[PDB]
């Protein structure tokens, strides 16, 4: 096996802990479904980043609501480039798979679709 | 072909816009680029002085140049405007056709 | 082999370069001991993050005091969620092992024990 | 000698860098200077409009120009890219030799 | 195969989008050349970080100018330690190779050479 | 007429001012415009690298060019300064007379 | 005759005096052309407003470059509602016409088209 | 006919978009009823201003909820004079009527009644 | 009749309520005298704007000291363009007259004379 | 011999290093010409001061472009009195001459002429 | 002759232009009287400095009220060391005299007496 | 005799009163030794300047620890040009000597050596 990163992003409308957690769950589960991941045992790590305007909650907490208790979770704050899409939660997961790079699916939700690399 | 790039130096944004707009509107130019923020060192009278200035790059043609010179002199607040034309050796054909269509 | 992240965290009482470096060493060495890592050759990379209140030193510098000269070291600043534990240094190491996900030990020191995922 | 300076006008930093990098990397240019912050007034369709733009100054040669034009058209997001070449009358000899060594 | 991180850094003189993008390209290409990487298929992920004084552009955008369309790209903001080298762009790439840790080359450009771990 | 615009690329404001001042003061130029904030992508050795740079636009004449080249080489901190002259096709007559009066 | 307001808006990419003036001219002339106004004698007044991020120039100055020397010109700063379109110049002209309200044309340029009341 | 301005004002208790919009509707409709305006065709323009403490919404948006789609709408921010009544929305409408100046009714609602020119 | 705007401006030396009110009165009365206005019945509305440095009083209050009780009065804050003339009070009045545009006189007092469109 | 100070001042339009350096050169050379100084050997020291709005460069650097390598150069920041002339570079030179106080010429350039003690 | 500096200082109670000017005059005249200076021809230069809390006026202006029109006057802002005496105006004059260093008198007024070097 | 300025500079690592005073003493004594000054009677004045980051003490106080009780001492704050050397104490002394300008030695200590005019 090798390692492939999986990326995705979701936006929220407000900095409310419930919204952050709910959005984080939606994104994490969608990423895992897209790539057929039925177990968290395949994840080496997950890194979450957020924009400067979301400070009421940590997305990493949502990960433990869906059972990723043993997956290392790290988070960081993003660079505030003017003109960027506001209120964005981004996730990079490191997946221990044999899937080719071009067969890994990435997930962009809500307004994050505009930043999809297509 | 006779296509040319004219460099006009202006003291302020109001002048830069006023001239650039007039030249394009009147078809003395097809396109004017304004480059802000220059520092100008030049000889004046008996010494060397500095000024601010902006640079206009005017994409025009040689046949309209005589008209351009007069129009710029009328608008530009100097006894001696700095207006010089550099020739175009070659270029994108569609672009050059475009300049001619929009100039004159 | 595959890749497993190793996580840990430690807190400090003040933003003093000596405290940061000392704490970072304690945490890194403890993580490596916990997982039996006798060589830095097994580490793909180490990512350090800190809270907004620790700016006097870079934890990554401590890593070179314990000899991790060839281990890629990256660092980032954490999201300032109100109510979070202050003065926290967190580390994610990426380990090139064949150890199962649930056999990787994580280390939480000082007041960071309260944030341990247990 | 055939050395030339090509002026290419681009809409954004991403385009400016993408083109500048491609031309130098592919040896269609020895050196590209990017001048940011332009204000562009030009005739479009039936009226006078403005845009932002950046200016690229490409130090190349006439023999590579045909290739440059095609490569820029492929990268530049316009039907009609603004690509014009101004000739070099004279210059630092070592520099001009350098441009030729690095172009083509 | 296993995973090795690749590090490098470059500095810029001003926070101008063109400078950031140009510098990012120079650094990414140099890292890849140094390690003989002829394809982006070998990269699991790339993480970019920047100092607090570079906010006009995202280095990750440069990565797509050189064709890394399928490489997961994540970015984060660095810790503002006083006295640090200003205007620095740092990159950590995760490379799916069989190259030994001590055979991976790292790249430091411009003023970033002063922070090279040598 | 022989009037020319010389493009000199410099690494910093100190160099830009030092050269611009020397050329005007010594009558190798009548006017120098400094355009700040450039991004420079160029081939160096075996690869493509970037730098900052400023651009000087020197309004001079061809007969003074040989002197200009030597003076710039003395002041400019490079083995190979980038000094190129673009010809002036035509321009404001008073301005061109002025350049000649102040150059040489 | 009666009075009808004419509205329009234009956006700019940066707070540069030249851009502001150029944009203002484009918008004013386009408004006048749209409604067939061949003389400034029909304008009772023009009110310009700008967003909080455009402070390098007064749009009213542009009006005198196109000859509106006798048209009363007033300007004001807009309310900074989060999420609003940035760098927007808006103009309200009061036109002394007999044109019906629904025959007055309004002009939205550049990114201001998204805020057109259609 | 001639032109008469119509003025009114309303206060809100909090900077909530719903409150702003609801208050704006109440005020606009009340102004129109007070003066017998059965059609928006008589309005040359409407200018809204707000105090510095109301930034969550634009009052002008409310105007389109009550159908003033063709009425030119402009808005601006008010001068923050200390001691002034907080959270105030003020409206000036320009009405193309033959009504005498002293027969035009003005509307002050909620706490704005204290600033009525009586 | 039609509508013509009347403009004028005055400067003050300090942000003192008395100075603001006194200056406002001087300007309003001078504008009305210049144009021969013997009654406030001819004014559709008056709009006052001030620079960012005058916050101790509302110019509109002065208008009621000279009896403009039935004239709609609106005020707004001006755009802080660097280099602008400080402490300026500007007034736009909308006058229901048959006076040609070029026969309307405008008033600039104190240091505001430098900004007169002549 | 004795000591006489020489004063002068120049203004710039923007805080651009090139403008500062160019302006500084113009002023220093003009001061020296005005007083007939053919050598820097006569200068005991030069003190430069600038207003609070010029921070991109040190005027003292310009002095070394014109060869004052052995002249002691000191610089300081000026008192920000409101209403003062912006962007001003002031120079005091201490000249070891036998010139009477009233025969020393002072130089004021650009907008600094308004502050000349005449 | 040689050069001797003369120092003195005075404090004021408030940042009022009149107080600054009056205090400056008192101090300058007292310094000159203390040292027997009957003419300004003996002064090479005068340097004024003030604390960070006095910004309403320039002390140098006072110097021209007492006739020092030809004396070069320079001013600068002082270092805000916590605990320092507030609202202090300090003056250094350079006097072209043959007076021994220990025969030059210095003047400290009001609360500045506490900082006298005795 | 005539007047020659003497310059020097020293840097400190932190804004601690002891460090400032100690550094100031080292620099002053070194300047005096370099130029052979055995007495303070030859000094007309000393001017100290510091960077914006040193506010815990006044360098002038150090001068009285080494006995310069009768030497006029003035101090000022430096211009904060970005990129400048931090924590710098600079001194200009005015020396009543017959020493030629090019025989006066200047002193640069610690990191200030990088700014020496050589």
Numbering used by the authors:
A (entry chain G), C (entry chain X), E (entry chain E), G (entry chain I), H (entry chain K), I (entry chain C), ...: 1 to 118
B (entry chain J), D (entry chain F), F (entry chain N): 1 to 104
Pull verbatim passages from the article behind this deposition.
When expressed as ectodomain constructs stabilized with SOSIP mutations, trimers based on this clade A sequence can be readily produced at high yields while preserving the native-like, pre-fusion conformation targeted by known broadly neutralizing antibodies (bnAbs). Herein, we introduce cryoelectron microscopy-based polyclonal epitope mapping (cryoEMPEM): a method for rapid, high-resolution structural characterization of antibody-antigen complexes without the need for mAb isolation. Twenty-one high-resolution maps of trimer immune complexes with polyclonal Fabs provided detailed insights to the nature of antibody responses at eight unique epitope clusters predominantly targeted in BG505 SOSIP immunogens.
This nanoparticle consists of four copies each of two complementary trimeric components, referred to as T33-31A and T33-31B. Consistent with the structural data, biolayer interferometry (BLI) experiments demonstrated that the antibody binding profiles of BG505 SOSIP fused to each nanoparticle were equivalent to those of free trimers. However, reduced binding to antibodies targeting epitopes in the middle/lower part of the trimer such as the fusion peptide (PGT151, VRC34, and ACS202), gp120–gp41 interface (35O22), gp41–gp41 interface (3BC315), and the trimer base (RM19R and RM20A3) was observed in the context of the assembled nanoparticles. This is likely caused by the crowding of trimer antigens on the nanoparticle surface, limiting the accessibility of epitopes near or at the trimer base; an observation consistent with previously reported data using other nanoparticle scaffolds. While nanoparticle display did not improve the overall levels of NAb responses, it had a dramatic effect on the epitopes targeted and angles of approach of elicited antibodies, particularly after early immunizations.
